[PDB]
Amino acid sequence: GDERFYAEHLMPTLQGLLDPESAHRLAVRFTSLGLLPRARFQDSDMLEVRVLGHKFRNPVGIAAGFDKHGEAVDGLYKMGFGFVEIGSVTPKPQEGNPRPRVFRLPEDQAVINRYGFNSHGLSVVEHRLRARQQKQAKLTEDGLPLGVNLGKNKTSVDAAEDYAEGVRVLGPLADYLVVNVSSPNTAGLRSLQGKAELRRLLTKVLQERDGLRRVHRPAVLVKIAPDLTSQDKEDIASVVKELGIDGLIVTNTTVSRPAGLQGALRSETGGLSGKPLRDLSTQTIREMYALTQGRVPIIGVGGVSSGQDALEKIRAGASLVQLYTALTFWGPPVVGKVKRELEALLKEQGFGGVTDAIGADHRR
Numbered sequence: 587g588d589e590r591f592y593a594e595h596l597m598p599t600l601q602g603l604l605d606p607e608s609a610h611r612l613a614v615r616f617t618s619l620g621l622l623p624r625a626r627f628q629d630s631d632m633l634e635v636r637v638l639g640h641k642f643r644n645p646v647g648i649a650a651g652f653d654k655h656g657e658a659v660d661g662l663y664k665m666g667f668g669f670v671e672i673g674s675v676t677p678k679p680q681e682g683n684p685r686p687r688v689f690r691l692p693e694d695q696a697v698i699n700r701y702g703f704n705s706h707g708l709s710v711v712e713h714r715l716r717a718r719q720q721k722q723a724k725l726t727e728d729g730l731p732l733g734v735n736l737g738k739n740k741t742s743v744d745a746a747e748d749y750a751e752g753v754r755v756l757g758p759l760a761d762y763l764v765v766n767v768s769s770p771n772t773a774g775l776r777s778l779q780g781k782a783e784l785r786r787l788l789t790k791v792l793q794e795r796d797g798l799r800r801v802h803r804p805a806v807l808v809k810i811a812p813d814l815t816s817q818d819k820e821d822i823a824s825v826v827k828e829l830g831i832d833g834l835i836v837t838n839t840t841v842s843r844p845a846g847l848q849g850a851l852r853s854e855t856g857g858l859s860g861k862p863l864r865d866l867s868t869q870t871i872r873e874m875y876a877l878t879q880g881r882v883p884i885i886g887v888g889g890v891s892s893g894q895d896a897l898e899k900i901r902a903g904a905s906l907v908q909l910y911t912a913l914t915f916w917g918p919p920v921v922g923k924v925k926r927e928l929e930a931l932l933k934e935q936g937f938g939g940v941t942d943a944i945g946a947d948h949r950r
């Protein structure tokens with residue numbers, strides 16, 4: 587699990603041999619078989635966070651979209667992530683967009699994808715999680731929670747009902763649910779982010795959640811785009827506080843193309859992730875934290891590949907962070923790297939632990 591060997595040799599060679607979707611599929615397969623490094627980094631108490639009704643032994647999770655179908659959850663904990671989010675899962679199976687649909691921008695340390703919610707569907711994922719449900723219960727009790735990100739089918743005629751089905755089927759199996767209302771790659775999905783129908787949508791979601799038995803009742807979070815107007819964000823903050831949404835995930839990929847991208851493939855359609863997204867997502871965290879008065883837990887995601895990247899989102903108001911794209915460039919060692927650097931920076935800047943640092947920028 588040597589960071590330099592993966593970063594300088596293994597990964598560059600893998601990317602030379604495999605297109606990104608092939609690499610992704612191979613990585614999921616290897617991970618689910620435990621064929622990858624087991625974290626030697628043992629988490630210190632400084633990294634522990636309590637939010638969303640759970641203990642997280644460290645604040646660094648794997649973002650949705652890597653393990654879309656729930657196949658590699660245990661290998662991902664083994665890799666050192668403090669929590670795992672699977673999905674997005676749609677109600678029925680669907681294939682997603684035609685290939686190629688994932689693109690590498692090496693010069694920018696970025697990826698563009700237009701997968702389009704390729705999904706095994708709720709039923710398959712349900713049985714997959716049921717097969718390890720008790721193992722997960724112990725992991726969660728141990729401080730390693732599981733999130734499930736819910737999507738909707740391309741041809742769906744009623745978006746709210748798709749999400750409602752997801753709550754009923756996978757909600758009993760998840761520590762938290764994510765209503766993904768921010769994918770760049772499904773027609774019309776992102777406009778579920780406007781006020782009146784976001785309120786209608788989330789009201790129905792929360793009602794379905796509340797109808798689940800107490801011990802099987804997940805937290806519900808909303809995952810938003812980096813691409814929202816001031817008005818959108820203002821409206822989302824309002825609805826979230828009004829309905830009692832448990833948290834926000836900030837952010838999904840961007841449909842923007844920031845000035846300065848060098849990759850040959852920069853003009854491919856889809857969502858951009860990685861380094862070019864980093865500060866855009868950090869600023870969105872900062873804004874949503876202020877609009878919710880620091881009362882609504884935020885998971886910060888976008889361009890995290892170092893302890894500094896993570897701490898900047900934490901200080902901006904994130905209680906937890908996720909990464910994905912950094913894994914595709916640096917490989918598994920990046921997880922321990924981020925955790926180790928985060929702990930060092932926390933001591934360095936005088937924080938007793940992660941919890942003390944949450945939102946710290948707003949208190950200056």
Ligand SMILES: Cc1cc2nc3c(=O)[nH]c(=O)nc-3n(C[C@H](O)[C@H](O)[C@H](O)COP(=O)(O)O)c2cc1C
Binds near residue numbers: 809
């Ligand atoms: C290949 C790929 C597939 C993704 N699939 C999903 C998805 O299915 N559901 C979702 O909510 N986010 C998905 N995302 C977005 C990530 O969860 C994350 O929000 C985004 O990539 C920003 O974090 P990062 O810069 O560390 O990659 C995907 C991202 C990538 C790169």
Ligand SMILES: O=C(Nc1cc(Cl)cc(Cl)c1)Nc1ccccc1C(=O)O
Binds near residue numbers: 609688
């Ligand atoms: O996931 C990996 N690679 C990978 C390689 C290793 Cl050696 C380990 C792990 Cl977990 C993942 N790669 C990707 C995942 C999603 C989208 C694009 C890629 C890519 O390669 O461009």
Ligand SMILES: CCCCCCCCCCC[N+](C)(C)[O-]
Binds near residue numbers: 610652705706
């Ligand atoms: C029966 C429905 C089948 C849907 C399959 C969708 C593509 C799944 C490809 C493997 C997972 N992955 C995200 C790594 O491409």
Ligand SMILES: O=C1C[C@@H](C(=O)O)NC(=O)N1
Binds near residue numbers: 700703
């Ligand atoms: O939420 C999502 C969906 C994913 C996909 O296209 O499957 N692409 C993304 O970048 N974010």
